[PDB]
Amino acid sequence: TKSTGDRSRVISYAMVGTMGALTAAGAQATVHDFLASWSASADVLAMSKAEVDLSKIPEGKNLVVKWQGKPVFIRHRTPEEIQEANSVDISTLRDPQADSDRVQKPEWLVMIGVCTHLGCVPIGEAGDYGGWFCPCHGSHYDISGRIRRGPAPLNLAIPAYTFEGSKIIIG
Amino acid sequence: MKPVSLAKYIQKSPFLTKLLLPISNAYVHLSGYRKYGLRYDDLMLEENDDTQKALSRLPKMESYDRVYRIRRAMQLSIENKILPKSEWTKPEEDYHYLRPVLAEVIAERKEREAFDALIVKK
Amino acid sequence: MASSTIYNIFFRRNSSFYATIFVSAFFAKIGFDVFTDSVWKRANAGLTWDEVKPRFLNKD
Amino acid sequence: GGAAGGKTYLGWWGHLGGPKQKGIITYSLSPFQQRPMAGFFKTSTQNMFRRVMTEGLYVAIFGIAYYIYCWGKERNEFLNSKHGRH
Amino acid sequence: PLEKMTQECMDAPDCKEVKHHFEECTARVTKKVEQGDKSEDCIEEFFHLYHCARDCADPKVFKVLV
Amino acid sequence: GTPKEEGLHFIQHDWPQSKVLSGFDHASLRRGFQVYREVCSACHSLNLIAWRHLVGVTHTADEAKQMASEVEYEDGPDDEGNMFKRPGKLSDFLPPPYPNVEAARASNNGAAPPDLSCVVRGRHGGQDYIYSLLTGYTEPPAGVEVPDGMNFNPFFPGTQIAMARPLFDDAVEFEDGTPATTAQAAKDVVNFLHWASEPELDIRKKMGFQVITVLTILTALSMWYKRFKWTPIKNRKIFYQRPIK
Amino acid sequence: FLPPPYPNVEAARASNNGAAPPDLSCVVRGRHGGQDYIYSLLTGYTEPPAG
Amino acid sequence: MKILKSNPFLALANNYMIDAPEPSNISYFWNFGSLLACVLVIQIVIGILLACFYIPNMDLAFLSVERIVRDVNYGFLLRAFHANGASFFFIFLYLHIGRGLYYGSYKYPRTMTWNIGVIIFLLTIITAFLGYCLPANQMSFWGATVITNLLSAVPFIGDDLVHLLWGGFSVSNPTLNRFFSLHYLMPFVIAALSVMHLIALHTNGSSNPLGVTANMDRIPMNPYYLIKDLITIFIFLIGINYMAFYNPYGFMEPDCALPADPLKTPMSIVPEWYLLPFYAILRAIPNFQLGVIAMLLSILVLLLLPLLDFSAIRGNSFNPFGKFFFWTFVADFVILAWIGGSHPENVFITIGAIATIFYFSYFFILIPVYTILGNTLIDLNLSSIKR
Amino acid sequence: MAFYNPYGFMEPDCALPADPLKTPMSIVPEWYLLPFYAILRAIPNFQLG
Amino acid sequence: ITNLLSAVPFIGDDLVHLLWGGFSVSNPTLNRFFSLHYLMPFVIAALS
Amino acid sequence: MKILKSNPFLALANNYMIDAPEPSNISYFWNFGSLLACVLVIQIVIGILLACFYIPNMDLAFLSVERIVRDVNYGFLLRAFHANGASFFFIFLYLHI
Ligand SMILES: CCCCCCCCCCCCCCCC(=O)OC[C@H](COP(=O)([O-])OCC[N+](C)(C)C)OC(=O)CCCCCCCCCCCCCCC
Ligand SMILES: CCCCCCCCCCCCCCCC(=O)OC[C@H](COP(=O)([O-])OCC[N+](C)(C)C)OC(=O)CCCCCCCCCCCCCCC
Ligand SMILES: CCCCCCCCCCCCCCCC(=O)OC[C@H](COP(=O)(O)OCCN)OC(=O)CCCCCCCCCCCCCCC
Ligand code: HEM
Ligand code: HEM
Ligand code: HEM
Ligand code: HEM
Ligand code: FES
């Protein structure tokens, strides 16, 4: 060693430590990149979203669009349906939900349009309560979208849509 | 089975021996086990009963010298070097220190290889 | 001081050794990322989409 | 414990199956005292030079293989031409 | 751009012998096909001459195609 | 066999993607995409490149969406069955020009225009062969003839290709104002096709450099440590004291 | 295969109000009772009771 | 007694990886087994990952592979690593076989290890074919059609076996389903046979370049040979990463990026490069049954080696004739591969026939003759030295 | 069991194609995992279950 | 059953999406399940 | 020495199947380990064949199973045997536990 002790030991341990540090740095990237292939691919991501242009639906009209296989209706409620929908007592519903918090904008009502009882396509602008009506099992959904009578257990589902000007993105 | 070298057949004719001596000298120089100091008889395989028995009938000094030779050869082969030109195995020390014992053991084994096959011709 | 303190702190117990290894790896990843990003950016001069945007986009 | 196995040639430490040794002395040094990469370039260069000199011709004469490759390729290309079908 | 340079190296002094061979062929083949025979062509000589011309022309015009 | 039935060897070029550290020249990519759309999309098909594959490479999101909104696609059943049409979206593939192989064969004599998604990687020569093919339509030599509908191209195997000369002078007007000739357009479209073959070149070449550097450093350190640890064996001394009886 | 009366499920839904005639290939094995349930359903149409 | 020598599983690990006597002068050519194990592990993991995105059918396999390439997150790494590792596997296998052949490791007491290795080689060759036939490109379709038709050479039940393997009358959905199902199973059998390989080897230990007994000098494997293999591992990694990140389709022919058209016959129907010499041997013989017989024998002849070496020495370190003839055979093997790769033209037929003749002569005529000659020359010179 | 009653261990709601809108009356796993499902539904809380 | 992974405090509701390979039970889920079901019995045999 | 006690593979087989000291009064409830092993072997062998006709895709998985059941030669045997063996595995597992 041509020198004193306690010096080559430090050098060798430093080389080993650099070895280990670089090996761990490589292994982390290897594992993360080779396991990230299990996440959502581009093809699946491209189908995730859905766009609806609300400018083509005037007040008191319905547009049916597709979103992940579940149709979702939009309705531009006039202040009338807004005010009777807010008038109903929450606790009197079969499934108690309000309406002020049920829609981000009270002039726009967007719900997932499948029968909550056995998964059928209801007909809108009908029923005893003036909303969506399911002739598959003879049940009626109110104008606000909730269930009033019939074999449907719970209310209609609400999508996680976001508003951007005149275009709404569903997803 | 076993090596079938036919040098005995060649040695019957002195013409062939005289012709082939330089070729044999060149071949033994080319094989190059002397560069490690080994004898030719250290390279034969020892994994059967005959050789393992023969190695137990060697004089003690011969066994110790063989052990030293093999250890030195291995230590040389570890670091990829050879002995200098003055320590190479001379032809005088390259004799057969294992062939007679192995031949005796093989003869004893062959001796028994006959009584079992014995038949009565009547 | 000298080289004894370095051994005493880092390479004395196994636990400190492993902790130093892991922290050094964590910082070395970022260092190599920065170095390769700089090298790649200086390698491609004038032939990237963000560089060539003002030759196509603005004249619409 | 388990069973008496067959006849092998390794054993383990202590009973390695080798011959009886006598009068052998071995020295060494601690790896933390010796300087690594000492006598490396000289020894490696000498060993490589010796290896090239001695086992060189056993490999060099890959020599006729390249020539037969080149001749075969050239002749095959020549025979697939206008003057090769005459 | 490329066709012009190809035509220049078609007659530049670096492919003169292959150009001469191509001309000799074309003369012979035109005469033979005029007589009536239809069993000879020199796509091979055209191949050689075209490769020479392209070797000349392509790199010296690919550096301007920006 | 005979070179007439094998095709003349292609011409070697130099491209930005050939360098060890360089990637892609994106202006040439946009020019090649324009040339393909306006001269090639009539007969060939590229049904493996989506509209979303272009945003960030040769177009932005708004430009890609506006371009894709022009074309029309079929959009499944609705209510009482039926098959309606819809404007294009940002997740649809490029529209093929022909419905099936039979229609494509019928339209262009009896030849089927091959799909161009992976034609650069599927040809012996790469970009060079395609570029030499597009700019190799010469007058037939002496002694050879061409049947009706067949064209002469030495680079094509057999020197007979059933594709009339696709590119001509000033066929397209590039946005940047480059003088569009046959050679420049051919080079740009070859670059675009090569991008379409392997669209991940930039990222792959970027990570390869860092991986190689780290591996080199680790290899050097490993060699040094191996040299260090094996010292007490490579430097032994053996002495034989002869056992005198 | 035997011809399906409708080209897709949506046409079937449109024709028969809002219902959807289930496929009969594997219905017997997929109902709680099988043959007995199917036969009883076929032969069990009666006028409703009062109320 | 320490824990590592007491607990069963830890003792199993220790007896094979930590405490195991080894020859003290084994060169760098003894590391290829660890490289083979690492490559096999990489292949198993990568194949398991790739099986989560592949649909085995005629009309969906190629599209699934393309979707893997350009849509799945980091799919290009997966596919390139699988292909390049499968290519490197045969390189390391050939190097392992060459190491075993040069130093005469087939001799006793390691014959069982040699036979197990030969069986593993055959299994690996079979596994490679099914693996490459999956993407259903042009060469995969046509090469599978050509190769699976070789089963008709057996007398009796000739075309019946071909129909049973095809699951129909031509390469279609069922045969791809069969091939995908079988390609998953074979690597596990290969791993089990590798475990058997190691357990058969461990009973007697490794050899050394010198060729003499190594019982006098031994060192444990734990500190020394666990660090001599790291260099080879890192070198292999640096070799494979360059291919995966700068030339992924390196060993890959141009005709392997097109859909399988069953109407256009390609100009050349060739398998992957690592199977080329056996294809050349098969194509050399004009007869049909003789062709498949010779192709099988070209790999089955490695079992006849132990009873063909009449040499008192064990290896080629001290065998002047062996060193020459080994490299001659290697050159002949390379020539065979080159001939098999190219077209079956005029002169190439003669060259391939001559190369095949030499390949089958080397194993059957040259070895005994030169071993006997070396033994005779050495014995004569030693006998004629005292007088 | 395989020659005289193959679907004898099988619930009747398994001979129908999966309709992602048809909600079944009862959602249960196979019989050999039933006790753990019973244990899971007992606890009113979610994570505790 | 797959929704039970949401009980994890921090990375909950993300492991579920990673396992699903999307937003609901679709083609990638079936592919992954087939591959894992093929793989696991050999591990079980080794454990036995 | 006997060959079964000498060859390493035959020694491994012998030490676990041929000559293994066992208690002399174990009842019939100690017979379920072999049953479990045989059931597992049957499951693996049958599943290898079952994987030869299955297409792993949500849109096309049920029709593949139906084709296995009613179109392949003796496919119903394969399907029923796989399902019923998977069921019997848990019965024998519970008995073992
Ligand atoms: C399944 C879990 C994997 C397994 C993940 C964990 C296992 C790591 C794999 C390598 C294991 C190497 C074991 C070597 C024996 C050992 O543990 O000793 C610790 C050595 C230093 O030991 P030393 O040389 O004797 O000095 C110590 C001096 N004292 C403190 C005692 C006074 O210090 C070291 O050995 C540091 C080695 C590098 C540690 C950094 C992590 C890098 C490995 C993880 C990332 C790569 C994973 C690759 C997997 C193929
Ligand atoms: C996550 C992947 C890696 C996960 C971690 C991977 C590494 C796991 C530990 C390494 C492998 C297990 C150790 C094997 C050797 C061993 O048994 O050491 C135990 C020693 C005593 O062993 P001994 O030297 O033989 O002395 C006892 C001899 N008597 C007195 C009994 C006769 O007793 C001791 O002093 C230490 C006992 C510790 C036993 C293991 C505890 C489990 C590890 C806890 C986590 C450690 C921190 C991990 C940080 C990364
Ligand atoms: C657990 C077992 C495997 C791990 C241990 C293997 C040994 C690793 C040794 C060091 C090699 C990597 C050093 C470079 C690190 C780096 O820089 O990678 C950088 C790149 C990504 O860069 P980025 O996205 O972070 O850029 C950030 C942008 N700003 O990653 C990669 O190229 C992928 C990893 C490839 C490395 C080859 C690994 C070969 C092992 C077999 C394949 C894996 C088997 C399956 C594993 C589940
Ligand atoms: C020694 C082991 C193995 C070898 C030699 C091997 C070899 C190959 C080869 C050569 C290919 C062709 C790839 C291409 O041409 O692009 C391939 C493809 C494939 N292999 Fe393997 N493989 C092995 C292990 C495995 C394992 C264990 C699995 C599954 C668990 C697997 C699954 C696949 C799949 C799904 C493909 C098709 C994907 C593709 O071709 O891109 N392989 N294999
Ligand atoms: C996956 C495949 C393989 C694995 C995992 C494997 C494993 C190993 C390992 C680690 C060694 C020790 C290194 C050595 O001695 O060279 C070894 C030795 C050996 N292998 Fe392999 N091997 C494989 C393939 C083969 C093949 C294909 C053959 C022969 C055709 C073979 C024949 C041998 C022989 C004869 C030895 C003993 C060499 C000696 O002791 O000198 N192996 N095997
Ligand atoms: C699943 C839960 C399991 C548990 C808790 C378990 C535990 C045990 C225990 C404690 C014993 C020793 C009993 C005694 O000596 O009195 C035993 C024996 C045995 N086990 Fe298991 N084991 C299980 C599964 C398996 C499996 C899956 C296999 C084979 C595939 C297996 C094969 C065996 C065998 C062959 C024996 C010895 C013979 C016998 O007891 O029948 N066991 N097991
Ligand atoms: C190599 C081993 C195995 C393979 C390749 C395999 C493969 C398969 C395949 C392809 C299916 C689909 C059945 C269909 O399409 O109709 C299936 C179903 C099934 N497997 Fe396996 N399996 C294996 C082992 C096992 C094991 C060890 C178990 C349980 C311990 C098991 C339990 C089941 C069950 C419960 C089903 C569903 C039953 C049904 O489809 O009716 N399998 N398996
Ligand atoms: S969908 Fe069931 S009654 Fe409305």
Residue A41 host element (H or E): none
- Reply yes or no on whether A137 is catalytic: yes
Q: How many other C-beta atoms are found inside a 10 Å radius of the C-beta of residue F43?
A: 14
H337 to chain D: closest CA residue? D69
Q: In what order do the strands lie in the sheet with A109-112?
A: A62-65, A72-75, A109-112
Cβ atoms of H221 and H14 closer than 8 Å: no
Report the residue among A139, A142, A147, A149 best suited for mutation to probe ligand 8: largest number of ligand atoms under 8 A from its CB.
A139
- Token pair 């360098």 is found at F19
Across the interface, of A34, A39, A41, the residue whose CB is closest to H49 is A34
- How far off is chain C from F124, nearest CA to CA, in Å? 28
Distance H197 CA to ligand 6 centre (A): 29
Asked whether the beta carbons of residue G30 and residue I12 sit closer than 8 angstroms, the reply is yes
**Cα–Cα distance for residue pair D20/D9, rounded to 1 Å:** 15
**Residues C28, H75: Cα–Cα separation, whole Å:** 26
Ligand 4 atom at minimal distance to the Cα of residue H50: 35
- Separation of alpha carbons K50 and K69, rounded Å: 11
> Minimal Cα–Cα distance from D4 to chain K, Å?
8
Q: Which atom of ligand 1 is nearest to the CA of C14?
A: 30
* Cβ neighbours for H177, distance < 8 A, ≥ 6 positions apart: H56, H57, H167, K52, K53, K54, K55
Distance CA H53, CA H46 (A): 12
- CB-nearest to K52 from H178, H199, H200 is H178
CB H136 within 8 A of CB H258: no
Structural gaps in chain F: residues followed by a C–N separation over 2.5 Å: none
Distances (CA, A) of H1 to D16, E51, H11, H222: 20, 80, 12, 18
Q: Which residues of H are designated catalytic? A: 202, 206, 228-229, 272
Taking the centre of ligand 4 as the mean of its atom positions, its distance from the CA of residue H79, in whole angstroms, is 9
The residue type at A64: V
Taking the Cβ of residue H327 and every Cβ of chain D, the question of whether any pair is shorter than 8 Å is answered with yes
What are K73's two structure tokens? 């030669």
> How many angstroms separate the CA atoms of A102 and A85, rounded?
10
Beta carbon of H9 within 6 Å of any ligand 2 atom: no
- The answer to whether the CB of A68 falls within 8 A of the CB of A93 is no
For B58, residues 6+ apart whose C-beta sits below 8 A from its C-beta are B66, B97, B98, B101
Residue C13 structure tokens: 């117990």
Interface subset of G 1-51, CB within 8 angstroms of I: 26-27, 29-34
- Please count the residues of chain C: 60
Q: Which chain D residues have a beta carbon less than 8 Å from that of K7?
A: 6
Contact D58 H323 (CB under 8 A): yes
* Nearest to H21, CA basis, from H205, H216, H228: H205
* Residue D68 near residue H358 (C-beta atoms within 8 A): no
- Judge: G26–I14 Cβ closer than 8 Å, yes or no: no
- Parallel, antiparallel, or unpaired: how do β-strands A62-65 and A72-75 relate? antiparallel
Q: Across the beta sheet with A139-141, what order do the strands follow?
A: A123-126, A131-134, A139-141, A147-149
Residues of J in contact with A39 (CB under 8 A): 17-18, 21
H92 alpha carbon – ligand 1 mean position (Å) = 28
Q: Is the Cβ–Cβ distance between A110 and A63 less than 8 Å?
A: no
Segments of chain H assigned E as strands: 21-23, 218-220
d(CA J25, ligand 8 centre) in Å:
23
Distance CA B19, CA B25 (A): 11
Backbone break loci in chain H, preceding residues, C–N > 2.5 A? none
**Number of DSSP helices (H) and strands (E) in chain H, helices first:** 15, 2
| Ligand 6 atom nearest residue J45's Cα | 30
CB–CB of K28/D15 below 8 Å? no
Alpha carbons H97 and J20: distance in angstroms, whole number: 45
Angular region, K68: left φ>0, alpha ψ -120 to 50, beta rest? alpha
D82 touching chain E per CB within 8 A: yes
H70: region left, alpha or beta (phi > 0 left; psi from -120 to 50 alpha) = alpha
Report phi then psi at A63, rounded to 5: -125, 130
Please give the distance, rounded to the nearest whole angstrom, from the Cα atom of residue H3 to the centre of ligand 2: 9
* Distance set, CA F124 to CA E43, E51, H256, H267 (Å): 21, 18, 11, 12
- Method of determination is cryo-EM
Inter-CA distances, H119 with F31, H44, H114, H125, H297, Å: 57, 19, 9, 10, 13
CB contact under 8 A, J38 and H53: no
Please give the distance of CA F87 from its chain centroid, rounded to a whole number. 29
Flag if K57 and J29 touch (Cβ within 8 Å): no
User: At which residue do the structure tokens 């046959």 appear?
Assistant: F182
**Which residue has a Cα nearest atom 41 of ligand 5?**
H207
Residues of F in contact with E44 (CB under 8 A): 3-4
* Cα of F180 vs its chain's centroid, Å: 21
Cα distance between residue H63 and residue H72, in whole Å = 12
Copy the structure tokens of residue G24.
């009969």
Distance from C-alpha of H95 to C-alpha of H32, rounded to nearest angstrom: 7
- Chain B contact present for H214, CB below 8 A: yes
Whole-angstrom Cα distance, residue F184 to residue F180?
6
Q: Which element (helix H / strand E) includes J16?
A: helix J15-20
Residue H47 beta carbon below 6 angstroms from any ligand 4 atom: yes
- Which of H87, H358, I16, H282 shows the shortest CA–CA distance to G24? I16
Residues with CB under 6 A from ligand 3: A 23, 26-27, 29-31, 33-34; C 33; F 207, 210-211, 214-215; H 42, 45, 81, 237, 241
**Atom in ligand 4 nearest the alpha carbon of residue H256:** 15
With a 6 Å cutoff on the Cβ, whether K60 touches ligand 7 is no
Q: Which residues pair with A74 in a beta bridge?
A: A63, A110
Chain B and chain E touch, per 3+ beta carbon pairs within 8 A: no
DSSP secondary structure of F86-125? EE--TTSBPPPSSSSHHHHHHHSTT--PPPSTTSSTTSTT
Query: How near does any CA of chain I get to the CA of J41, in Å?
Result: 18
CA distance A87 to J6: 37
Q: Across the interface, do F224 and D37 touch by the CB < 8 Å criterion?
A: yes
Closest CA to H124 of H70, H48, H206, H197: H197
The rounded distance, in Å, linking the Cα atoms of F149 and F167 is 17
Cβ atoms B25, B31 nearer than 8 A: no
